[PDB]
Design a binder for this molecule. Structure first.
Ligand code: PRO
Ligand code: PRO
Lengths: 425, 425, 426, 426
């Protein structure tokens, strides 16, 4: 994990970065695809996974490697692996422990994407996921069984902005001998470390917060390295020596089991590999993640207060709020804030929200979150237009719903902009 | 397709590139993740796929778009889509027309990767692929049936360096109402256009030739737009309106059917999206593809002749050679050459090849092909060490086999380097 | 003009100069191009004539770099900006823009090693003499001014030496003699002090350091305040006398864009110290967090300066904000948000003690840079200022026992802990 | 020294200066960094002292850019190279490296618009006078030489004007007077003519054009032949007299790296026209195909020049290789592989005919650049050389009816077809 016990701010700046022979203080962009092997042994050794080193950029990259380590350090885990996007980090994570005919138990509150994947695409492939209501931790136990291999939820609903009892669902899963995978995109390691509250694997859509400016895509998978793969016995690929990899037992890697299996199977075969550039820009984003998340909260705090007190605001979801049905969860798991993404409904309903959008100057109309620039959009008509009233209202998406992602601009300017706009709907 | 009927050299330089309002002569790197929508309608419109424009970089990118068009133009197809890597362009291509419990008929001669994917990973997902011997076009018909939805082969075996009767297998597939997907990595549009000899879809690993210098990864999928999806009837997802996409019938797009379905399903859900940088470097590579491939052939020609005449060379595979079991295929389908990748066996067997490797100065020991720098490696101990003697000798990988990828250096220097080295094994 | 709807720093550093093209792309595209297609022969001819606004040649204009120009100027509260390859190039251009052969410049003794040697050796060879004055006494500049003097140069915070200067004072003394006031605001950044609003006419920057923020990309920026009469003073003819090469165009006629437009059209076009659109993109990213980053570098440096002052093995510690530094008054008047994150320090054991301290710290990297997100430490006299020797070395506050530290954005405690252990091993 | 195991152009452009780091990465890493961690206080001090080889500061040294230096020099068959931000910056540095105030340069009249105005306006202001001679008669240079003259400058192929020059001739005339011969080989590239091997001492390049090859990235390269006695001639003191700032180091003591090492240590460090490691990476990619690309640009231009000569509506066509151009002899002697892909042409209808032709072609883009993979066309007098007017305009072969064309690597037939249709519409 973290060697000389460094604090978050130090880890987000140094984690997994070494200095090569050139003395280059910044991580070089290893925009290469292959690596020269010392001799014919090392070649066979690297491809056999028995000799530590670079192999192929689809599999390995000195730049991307620093991201794996660094994110893991922040997430306080044991090993990380990066991928083309968040969607791919999810697809890989799932496929690593779910075969055909098997199933997984995932929360009702999910990003339009994560959802339409679990339900339409990966099922089509014979892996259906049973959607439970995250508000009642026990609600998962009811759909669990023998074909179930992992309990999946999002650290903060998208757009349900609903918290969940991490520790509860973690045991409910371990009691049945399966792992807890938490999609921490919305919370980030600075706000919450699912791996330290009952989670085994944490996925991220670095595209959003880790990246920081809406310029780069990428996903990350971090493992806690705290789940006996043999014990539970429910994960064969992990137990049964791999013929294709020289009878290697993934469970023998320990803290690196889950991640070295994605890299050697899913990643190598499906190839949703990140480009060294993207990884570079992620390293820059991480070098300031905390600082930006800190402002993302204090800004959202101020913007939420002003919005709650405005007559023209019907309702406002935001766990930290003293009267949100999740306030208690917030205080227990999110001591530093609940993010900067929130939903709200206006008093003039649907036509009013879109109207507000059409008047704001500092809020951009687009599909994204966690940009340094503030954003707003109406989920139902976009990011979740892949779900019918059936799932739509099941994930909290109502015709009057409007979503906001608070940037790092000046709170006064954002409030002023919001004011002038509402003063016209 | 190609509007004012331009020749290959003109298309590889201009295809799908327009000039924006800035006047920028070079395609800008759109290192962005989202796009600002005009109003709430356009947002809903883009996400509904009813309004042409950018949506999300996982789905769309102005830079990557030029690659889609450009490659397609060269491949002489109707529509292209790019992806994170070649492996992902393959995974996506397959998943676009193969559900669970279904199967596909693919050649025995395949890249270590393409293979271990079709066989271990995608089966695990309940899609097994029956490996036929490409030498006998009829050999495919025997394993075809009702669950079969596509016939897949590589334009040039890796490392079988075996040609195949494109037109033969194309009909053998259309007679049974399925499509022909040809992995043209090794041949490229300048040497062969599978789409014009019985192929419906062509996949590429731009990582290799299109890229040109071993710096960038990426895959491409191009469709010929010449297969009635309704007629054959064997492709439901293409016939049955998509609920998630507003009851859209993929077959209604025509020339853009196959590609807009990968982008809207597999890509959007699995997210093996290319980074705008990678796409940029591909555009540069394409702007010179032909010129480099031209030298790749004339260089390999000269290097093959010298190698055939050297006493210490046991055997040498290279279709163009007057006595290779494929010479006739070569003359019919490859009028401009058969590439620059070839295999050879030495007279001192295994230990001799690796020895040759350990002596060469201008040939680099690594896992890659089509680099401007020349490369050599022993497949059995690396790129195909995922197959047992069973598949290993089934794809032409023998203990004395050595593979070479001819660069663009000076033929005399390469021959000289090879000479001095052989003069020591 | 300037900042339209009167926005605050945090909003400008994130939005300033950034429009949405037809592609609708939210992030600024990286325009890695060298040329631009012109509408017919006239648009082409009119652009090259500088009469038609638009792109011409990346050596002169770039859509990506353009956002940098606007944004940086916006933050620095100026009217126009032009960016260049490095901080050194921005400085070289600023001078050369208003300095011919036979002219002279009066500059502070406290200057970064490069800047010094540029004024003293490189520009000397071309008939541009520079008088190095002691910035502590504003009147000292008056003494060296004369007919050939054409500009007064100072740094917002000496490098090294950490000495502040009376902006308004030197500002007046310069305008009273009809010359411009050039401030190299590198160490301060627009967020700590805006020299253009306290008597300065042109402010240059080394985006390499703070603006970029991670030690990964290089570039310089020149920003003009556009509130200095070029005609009036009369000492800047090129700004008044029509430019033959440019259809008799008179640069002073451009108003708020006179100085920078002269650089782009003269010095920049001809010498070509051009930034690459890539770098510009990375700078934009940096600017998008400038305020947040500069904020921590300071809170961090404050604590670390405290600890280091109380520590027995510390001979002395320069940091203007310290209640008794000979510049404290200048700090309160001009630097309400802090005095940055770069300070010098002397050790009890002299030089050998310092070099010992460097080699033992684990969170401070020994390299030549400042403003990195990572913390840095180095010994100025043997590196950054080794082209000067002792007389000029000592004219800028560089003593053999001097050690320089650049506080990063890591955890303040860890940094102190690291500092402790190293000092004990000294 | 130079090219070790005697390799050919195609092998050098792909391998020259590229090593494999510990990561084993085959492709040259992009070192997007500004500084480098130094081993203890001495390595640091020794690097800054220029006595310890290694990286110092990206403004001075970069592992990515370094491959560019070696490689380009290798191809140009020289001993040492240094790269800079642009072609203009490489030229500016080359001159300033051997030119002080009060010195003069004698250069060809045929110069790219920028180069001209740099010599004539920008460098004039700094006491560096340049005498513009007629390159057609080598003796013409002798006439302007004198005590203050310190270098003879010419382009391998005038821009525009497409005029060749007697390399060896001007080379001797310059060494007979103890001065260097500087050639701007942009238009030719090391693959068509290697000025360093035919009487030249320093050859500069605008990688922006051919080396890069796609109009996407900018940069300049300076290459020295290292076969000119600095001590002997005696006219280059700075090369002989110990450098105080550098521990009395004498630049001439460096041998084959004297000229370029002076640029990196003086002009470059102080003015900072530094390339970005990104650009360098893109240049390396370009170099990896230079020979192949230059080969087609020529076969293509040959055909296109033929067609255009026979065409009725073509008043005249400049291309040295043409059997009757006043430079054909120079072409056969010096350019055995072709004379490039940039030619000028006059139309029967004069200026208006030309500008008409431009606006009608579909495969030729109207922009300011050459050597793109895409074909280009432009009218020099209203753009690239509009800072010069008629007297100096006409001293470089730029006539109001002149049209310039840069042949790309598209299909030769399509280009001709496109040209036909446009001419008919004229
Ligand atoms: O500091 C930051 O937030 C940005 C992220 C990419 C480059 N620097
Ligand atoms: O011409 C070429 O081959 C290279 C490819 C990337 C940049 N230019």
């Amino acid at each position: 994990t973290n060697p000389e016990n460094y604090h978050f701010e130090t880890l987000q700046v140094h984690a997994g970065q070494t200095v090569d022979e050139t003395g280059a203080r910044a991580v070089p962009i290893y925009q290469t695809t292959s690596y020269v092997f010392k001799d014919a042994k090392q070649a066979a050794g690297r491809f056999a996974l028995t000799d530590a080193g670079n192999i192929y950029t689809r599999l390995t990259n000195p730049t991307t490697d620093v991201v794996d380590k660094r994110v893991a350090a922040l997430e306080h885990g044991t090993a990380g692996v990066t991928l083309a996007t968040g969607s791919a980090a999810i697809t890989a994570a799932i496929l690593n422990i779910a075969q055909q005919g098997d199933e997984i138990v995932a929360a009702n509150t999910l990003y339009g994407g994560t959802y339409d994947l679990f339900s339409v695409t990966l099922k089509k492939l014979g892996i259906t996921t049973h959607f439970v209501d995250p508000d009642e931790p026990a609600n998962f136990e009811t759909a669990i069984n023998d074909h179930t291999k992992a309990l999946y939820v999002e650290s903060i609903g998208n757009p349900g902005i609903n918290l969940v009892d991490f520790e509860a669902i973690g045991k409910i899963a371990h009691d049945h001998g399966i792992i807890f995978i938490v999609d921490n995109t919305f919370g980030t390691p600075y706000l919450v470390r699912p791996l330290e509250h009952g989670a085994d694997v944490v996925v991220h859509s670095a595209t959003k917060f880790i990246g920081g400016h809406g310029t780069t895509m990428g996903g990350v998978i971090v493992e806690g390295g705290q789940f006996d793969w043999r014990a539970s016995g429910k994960y064969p690929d992990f137990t049964t020596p791999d013929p294709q990899y020289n009878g290697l037992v993934f469970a023998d890697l320990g803290g690196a089991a889950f991640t070295t299996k994605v890299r050697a199977e899913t990643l190598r075969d499906t190839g949703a590999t990140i480009s060294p550039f993207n990884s570079f820009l992620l390293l820059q984003g991480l070098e300031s993640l905390s600082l930006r998340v800190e402002r993302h909260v204090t800004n959202t705090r101020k913007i939420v207060a002003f919005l709650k007190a405005h007559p023209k605001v019907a309702w406002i979801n935001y766990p930290e709020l003293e009267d949100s049905p999740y306030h208690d969860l917030a205080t227990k798991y999110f001591p530093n804030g609940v993010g900067s993404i929130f939903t709200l409904g206006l008093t003039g309903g649907e036509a009013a929200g879109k109207a507000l959008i059409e008047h704001l100057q500092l809020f951009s109309l687009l599909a994204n979150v966690a940009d340094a620039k503030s954003l707003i959009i109406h989920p139902a008509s976009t990011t979740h237009a892949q779900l019918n009233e059936q799932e739509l209202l099941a994930a909290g998406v109502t015709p009057d719903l409007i979503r906001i992602s608070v940037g790092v601009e000046n709170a006064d300017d954002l409030i002023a902009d919001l004011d002038q706009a509402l003063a016209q709907v």
